[PDB]
């Protein structure tokens, strides 16, 4: 029931600022300390600072200061992080977690993914992969920038043997990557297959039927 | 600032057994309340950290007490008994003695299990996909181990070259094993003028390759 709610993915200029958010849900955030922690893609977790929740003081780690500033709305349950003069060493994941006395280091959110680029974002091209004991059927998620993208299979109703691969980039300096899914063979005229693919930076939201192939 | 070293950058450990892995300090840990100011962490593929153990020794509630920890002055130990599959992922130390709070540099566990064959697909080009100008086919190893693999596309049994590309998952959360994607990609009017398209797998859980094949239009 506690839960932190980070905010979505961005793509930032080169330059600019961004301002991520983390809310409190089942308890107040005045009563915790707020720490943040970067990991850049590939690379190892990083902690920036912590904010004490009740009083607003903050402790960072020199490495960022002039770059981060930590922030907390006692009154609509959020904290903040925000970054300025952003290059792409600032591409990374953002983690917000709390810690409390009791509790320690009990509770993170998701994370934000932030691309710092200045590239205009692509949204996917979503491809069934058709069906040929045990079938494979898949989608191709093809042709976007920045990370991340969200699959799910069924709206999340299937999870048992997917396989979200990977984003590779292309020549071009786009990513495409593939889910796939193996199911009884005995299903394939019976059950319904959906990706269902999300991109924030685009505001792309698709939901492609895999269906057995032709003739 | 405190450095936490984590050594070695990789630790392999056979799914049953036991394994222990090390945080060194720069300075020593110990509070005046006589706490070593030393955490533990797991972050699993795609997921936030997840706290294992509090100030060397404590279990964090809800975790599993095949985890453990020792240590006093600047050498910790994390230990692992009975390694599940789950536990696949990158141990991390962290120090609260002095601001700033310091990470380890990590530690991932890579876990052993035996080989395995990988079963081969192979996907056509959807017709909504041959409708934008561009063709992707696709072949599909699931489940095998270990990683290492060849993947060759042939086009009319002419051999393929520079025209693909390939991604790997991370060892596989229940089976400890990978899955791996190669991806052809030609024009409509290539695709068009070719018949049969095939993908050969080369792996050492096999005792020969594997060729999955179709031919262009017969469904
Ligand atoms: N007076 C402490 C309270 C505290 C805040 C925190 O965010 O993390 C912690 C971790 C610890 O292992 C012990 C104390 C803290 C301080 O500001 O450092």
Redesign the pocket.
């Known amino acids: 029931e506690v839960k932190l709610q980070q905010s979505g993915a961005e793509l930032v200029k080169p330059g600019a600022s961004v301002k991520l958010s983390c809310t409190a849900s089942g308890f107040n955030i005045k009563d915790t300390?707020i720490?943040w922690v970067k990991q850049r893609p590939g690379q190892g977790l990083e902690w920036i600072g912590?904010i004490n929740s009740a009083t607003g003081l903050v402790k960072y780690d020199p490495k960022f200061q002039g770059k981060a500033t930590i922030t907390v709305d006692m009154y609509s349950n959020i904290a903040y992080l925000r970054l300025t003069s952003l290059t792409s060493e600032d591409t990374a994941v953002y983690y917000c977690g709390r810690?409390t006395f009791p509790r320690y280091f009990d509770l993170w959110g998701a994370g934000t993914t932030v691309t710092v680029s200045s590239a205009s974002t692509k949204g996917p091209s979503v491809f069934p992969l058709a069906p040929s004991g045990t079938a494979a059927l898949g989608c191709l998620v093809k042709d976007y920038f920045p990370e991340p993208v969200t699959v799910s299979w069924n709206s999340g109703a299937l999870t048992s043997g997917v396989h979200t691969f990977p984003a590779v980039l292309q020549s071009s300096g786009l990513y495409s990557l593939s889910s796939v899914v193996t199911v009884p063979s005995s299903s394939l005229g019976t059950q319904t297959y959906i990706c269902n693919v999300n991109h924030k930076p685009s505001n792309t939201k698709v939901d492609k039927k895999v269906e057995p192939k032709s003739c | 600032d405190i450095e936490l070293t984590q050594s070695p950058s990789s630790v392999p450990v056979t799914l049953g057994e036991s394994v222990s892995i090390s945080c060194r300090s720069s300075t020593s840990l110990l509070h005046s309340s006589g706490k070593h100011?030393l955490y533990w962490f797991l972050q699993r593929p795609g997921q936030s950290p997840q706290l294992l153990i509090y100030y060397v020794s404590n279990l964090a509630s809800g975790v599993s007490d095949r985890f453990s920890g020792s240590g006093s002055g600047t050498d910790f130990t994390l230990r692992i008994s009975r390694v599940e599959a789950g536990d696949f992922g990158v141990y991390y130390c962290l120090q609260?003695l002095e601001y700033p709070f310091t990470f380890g540099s990590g530690t991932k566990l890579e876990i052993k299990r035996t080989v395995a064959a990988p079963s081969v697909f192979i996907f056509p080009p959807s017709d909504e996909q041959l409708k934008s100008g561009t063709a992707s086919v696709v072949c599909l190893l699931n489940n095998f181990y270990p990683r290492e693999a060849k993947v060759q596309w042939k086009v009319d049994n002419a051999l393929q070259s520079g025209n693909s590309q390939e991604s790997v998952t991370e060892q596989d959360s229940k089976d400890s094993t990978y899955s791996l994607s190669s991806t052809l990609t030609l024009s409509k009017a290539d695709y068009e003028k070719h018949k049969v398209y095939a993908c050969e797998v080369t792996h050492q859980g096999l005792s020969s390759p594997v060729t999955k094949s179709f031919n262009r239009g017969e469904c």
């Open positions: 300390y720490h912590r810690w | 100011r609260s």
